[PDB]
Amino acid sequence: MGNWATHVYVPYEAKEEFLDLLDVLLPHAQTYVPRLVRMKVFHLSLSQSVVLRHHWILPFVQALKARMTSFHRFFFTANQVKIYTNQEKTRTFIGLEVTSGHAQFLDLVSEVDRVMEEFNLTTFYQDPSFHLSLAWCVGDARLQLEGQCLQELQAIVDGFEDAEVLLRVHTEQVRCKSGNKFFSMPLK
Ligand SMILES: Nc1ncnc2c1ncn2[C@@H]1O[C@H](COP(=O)(O)O)[C@@H](O)[C@H]1O
Ligand SMILES: [Cl-]
């Protein structure tokens, strides 16, 4: 029944405050790169996007659930704007990089990585930069977005007052997308 795109992540609850901040941030970035498009759903990756044989989807999800069930929830901060590209530099992303909480994300990834290895899937980047992507475009737009634009985006973020949105975000769940299927699991 096919091989399915499979990706593990921490869902980020995009509250109105957050989406309203993006209503300021994104047009600002679009003055440099108009073709940026807002993300539809917001996540912090714990795995690469891999491909997994259909009959292993449910077993994979169960393996993840068992490990995540024991993993304690934690707080993180994601308020540092950073530009990412995919590996081929055919997509560029504006993200909010995690600072405080990064070590807890590393611990999460260590558990996810074990599952990846159990299913012969690629483990996460060895130099991970955990982040919430806010917008993306085709191509390599680093030259337009880094420097002045990034500085201005950071200034907007630095000026934003609700700590719960970016400064003290509580992880609640992990999710695995496989194809068009989404499997949620609570952290402890
Ligand atoms: N050090 C890194 N850690 C995590 N993702 C990264 C890193 N460098 C670049 N990225 C890329 O960031 C892109 C967007 O990330 P995501 O929003 O998690 O899908 C992915 O295509 C990753 O390859
Ligand atoms: Cl453009």
For the chain, the domains span 1-188
Q: In what order do the strands lie in the sheet with 78-85?
A: 37-38, 131-138, 91-98, 78-85
Q: How many CA atoms lie within 13 A of 37 on its CB side?
A: 6
**Residue type (1 letter), 106:** L
Q: Please give the Cα distance from 47 to 30 (Å, whole number).
A: 29
Active site residue 131: yes
23 Cβ contact partners less than 8 Å away, ≥ 6 residues apart: none
> What are the backbone dihedrals phi and psi of residue 132, each rounded to the nearest 5 degrees, phi first?
-105, 110
Residue in this structure with the two tokens 């068992």, named with its chain if needed: 66
**Residue type (1 letter), 150:** L
* Cβ contact 134:25 at 8 Å: yes
Nominal resolution (angstroms): 1.2
> What are the backbone dihedrals phi and psi of residue 9, each rounded to the nearest 5 degrees, phi first?
-160, 165
31 Cβ contact partners less than 8 Å away, ≥ 6 residues apart: 149
Q: Please give the Cα distance from 137 to 35 (Å, whole number).
A: 6
| CA-based torsion, 46, 52, 55, 56: positive or negative | negative
174's tokens: 């992990």
Q: CA–CA distance from 184 to each of 48, 62, 68, 148 (Å)? A: 17, 11, 10, 39
Whether 87 has a binding-site annotation, put simply, is yes
Helices and strands per DSSP (H, E), number in the chain? 6, 11
86 three-class SS: coil
* Cβ contact 136:38 at 8 Å: no
Q: Which of 28, 54, 131, 170 is catalytic?
A: 131
Active site residue 72: no
* Cβ contact 18:116 at 8 Å: no
CB-based neighbours (< 5 A) of ligand 2, an ion: 33-35
- The helix or strand, by DSSP H or E, that contains position 185, with its residue range, turns out to be strand 181-186
24 Cβ contact partners less than 8 Å away, ≥ 6 residues apart: 156
Would residue 45 be called left, alpha or beta, if left means φ above 0 and alpha means ψ between -120 and 50 degrees?
beta
- The helix or strand, by DSSP H or E, that contains position 164, with its residue range, turns out to be helix 163-166
CATH homologous superfamily of 1-188: Cyclic phosphodiesterase (3.90.1140.10)
73 Cβ contact partners less than 8 Å away, ≥ 6 residues apart: 170, 171, 172, 187, 188
* Cβ contact 81:150 at 8 Å: yes
Whether 166 has a binding-site annotation, put simply, is no
Q: Shortest CA distance to 42 belongs to which of 82, 78, 1, 10?
A: 10
Strands 131-138 and 3-11: unpaired
Residue in this structure with the two tokens 């990412």, named with its chain if needed: 84
CB atoms near residue 151 (< 10 Å): 10
**Residue type (1 letter), 44:** L
178 Cβ contact partners less than 8 Å away, ≥ 6 residues apart: 4, 5, 6, 7, 52, 57, 60, 61
147 three-class SS: coil
Q: Ligand 1 centre and the CA of 12: distance in Å? A: 16
